[model samples]
Target: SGAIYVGNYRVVNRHLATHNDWANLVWEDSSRDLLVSSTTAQGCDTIARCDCQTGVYYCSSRRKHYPVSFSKPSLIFVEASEYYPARYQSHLMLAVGHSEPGDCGGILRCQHGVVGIVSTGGNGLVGFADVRDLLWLDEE
Candidate 1:
């Protein structure tokens, strides 16, 4: 039920679930530029733009810059209740060596494309929600 403004356009929550640890937002603007994940800041849905030619990513929210390797993937375990509540479900998550609180909803990217979004992390391990499973949700 939260709304965030990016530039002159307002982005709103498109989908979410109680059990699932992720949410979807609508990005109205269309461009050839690539979008990168970032933390929410300053009453805005923060994000970064990837410069394909320069192979760098820039975020206006924190005035941060990064190289493509910043999002490089690693293997980690994902504990979720995807089907049964009694037992947890296991899936492959794109993990990074380090993460911070409020990093949830950040994007996990590989060389091919984005594979997941940050969901849970602790003890030097960061897990992500698989984009493949997310895309299979039944729409109503």
Candidate 2:
């Protein structure tokens, strides 16, 4: 009855001096086993979810063309709806990658929020994976 999505920060271009730590909302459809990401091409935070199978995940959002960064640790958020969601709208944020997969898991989930996951391994796309053993560092 809902959807799944992941959030990651788009790489800050060294050439551009006006950008900061911008983020994105990657939409994943489990039914089709697909991946779509936010491409705020015309200045929309939730531009539209792009298909990742195309191997061309990018954008011209406000004229940035380059897509999100998969290299660094991402604070991914998963949820539902037909459109790309909000920045802080995610029910949870997880630090993925930059660490062993064995080191990630045990994430608490809510019925009202999304649980996002990612990996560039054999799963094809940044698919929805599960984790166990998580703790909060701050009470923010």
Candidate 3:
């Protein structure tokens, strides 16, 4: 049986690292900052919206355009990536020594102003891990 069938075409490669995530791009007279950190392999309710005054915020996994910072909260519903690893204990680079051992441990508090949502290091892969230590509102 001599077969000569040549026909194949399929293209689809996605590793969205552009859109935007990790909400908290504040600019209301300056108080909250850190508007740079996004990495998505596929899906995870990636909702980001901090549309200050009229800048732009709402990058649902690169499902559209993005140019963050409006002023305070024009949408406010972005940054919440937690697939696993809640009880952590890895202090080397992202330094987080002490506390965080079981269930992946992810309980940062700032009363109403705290940021640092970068978790995924046991194969899920999200390099650099974590380095969060935020506390605003007069260090409450």
Candidate 4:
């Protein structure tokens, strides 16, 4: 239940050493600078302002504050546990191979792992899922 983007290269989990959600974090590449990536999860939208710098985004879901950011140009990790006693979880690590820049475009923030909202903008329900699994091919 942990997903972190490792640049345009991949998105991995801190507890596991695998490429479980790699493609989901990286929306586009092909040697081009990344246009969109994944970010904090939770709910609510209207395409308002993120209220923070582009480098770090915040997700306000009740009292659980999960911070999403790139550890390096090719890595993104989140603090706070996706499970209960949430404060015990910290620094979910994600590593990568190549690419530059990142965007938190399609990450899902849900409660109990299945009930939540998508960070995607516009109208309608975005569905609670990993950013890599969304069918919205365009993040721009």
Candidate 5:
């Protein structure tokens, strides 16, 4: 995984700065449907993957003790096992959220090294080697 684990980050803080930019590898017998995210004050973050036949893709981000800004975009990664069974060791950064639901477009998903940008509208756009593929200008 390109991301350093919480314990591995130098000078760990009480909060995960830009934490939403990263997604946690989930262990399961079937395809992962949820991504576990940690918040300040031990709060919780939830990611919901709607059933293909159904229409629901919800991710909850809230903090009871601290204020949060839901306006920014976040990148979400989905990975499988590495060090152990279904560990976060072998990763494939999956998606980037241009904005959370209830605001603008839905989250994006990438597979097989392919990146996609999605919106509340159509299939949006696909065929990218990276998220930057859709950008007209470079930010970094």
Candidate 6:
């Protein structure tokens, strides 16, 4: 006995590329003096809160996102990536130099907090997404 059957499949609706991660500004008042201003750690007990379903920052014991190891080669200042041939995908987590189109979400601060954010780059190389691997779902 012998039989044969064949079928084809095809589905549509694909639009991906949304992982810049938080930053929807629309505030005025001179933009609050151009943002960036927070300092008052005199025996700080607890003051980190931004875990609105894992957006990052959830210090429960003064642990403002730690774990960074970049021996050499550094120069960060994102917040600019308006899209201009910026697309990278090689296991990510790369940083060689140059990054400008808009600079993608920026904020890659190092020693004082924040690990990475800016995603994608061009020419030299640049790509971030490490806030301890996006806090790995708010750890345990």
Better of 1 and 4 by TM-score: 1
- Please give, for residues 9-89, the per-residue lDDT of candidate 2 as tens digits: 221111111222123423332332223334333221121222121111211112222122232223444344333232222
Q: Against the true structure, whose lDDT is highest?
A: 1
Q: Rank the candidates by lDDT, best first.
A: 1, 6, 4, 2, 5, 3
Q: Look at candidate 4 and tell me the lDDT of residue 49.
A: 21
* Candidate 3 structure quality by residue, lDDT tens digits, 1-140: 00001111110101111233224221111012122332223222211222112222222233332332212212122232342223332311222222211212121212222222222223322112112321121211
Residues 1-140 of candidate 1: C-alpha lDDT, one tens digit per residue: 22323333322211222222123322211110111222243333233223211123222333443343322323443333332123232333433345543444455444434444444455665544433332212121
Better of 1 and 3 by TM-score: 1
Residues 53-112 of candidate 6 have per-residue lDDT tens digits of: 122321222324323333222333333333322232222355555554344444444433
TM-score of 2: 0.17
Where does candidate 5 have its weakest 10-residue lDDT segment? 7-16
What TM-score goes with each of the models? 0.36, 0.17, 0.17, 0.18, 0.17, 0.22
Clashing pairs in 5: 81-87
Worst 10 residues of 1 by lDDT: 28-37
Instruction: Judging by lDDT, tell me the better candidate of 4 and 5.
Output: 4
Q: What is the Cα-based lDDT of residue 12 in candidate 5?
A: 12
The model with the greater lDDT, 3 or 4, is: 4
Q: Distance (Å) between predicted and true CA of 72, model 4?
A: 33
- Give the Cα-based TM-score of candidate 5 against the true structure: 0.17
The model with the greater lDDT, 1 or 2, is: 1
Model 4 / residue 11 / CA error / Å: 5.1
Q: For candidate 4, lDDT tens digit of each residue in 73-118? A: 1222222322212122121212121211122222322221211112
Question: Candidate 3: lDDT of 123?
Answer: 32
Error of 5 at 60 (Å): 15
lDDT score of model 5?
A: 0.21
Candidate 2 residue 33 Cα shift, in angstroms, is 5.1
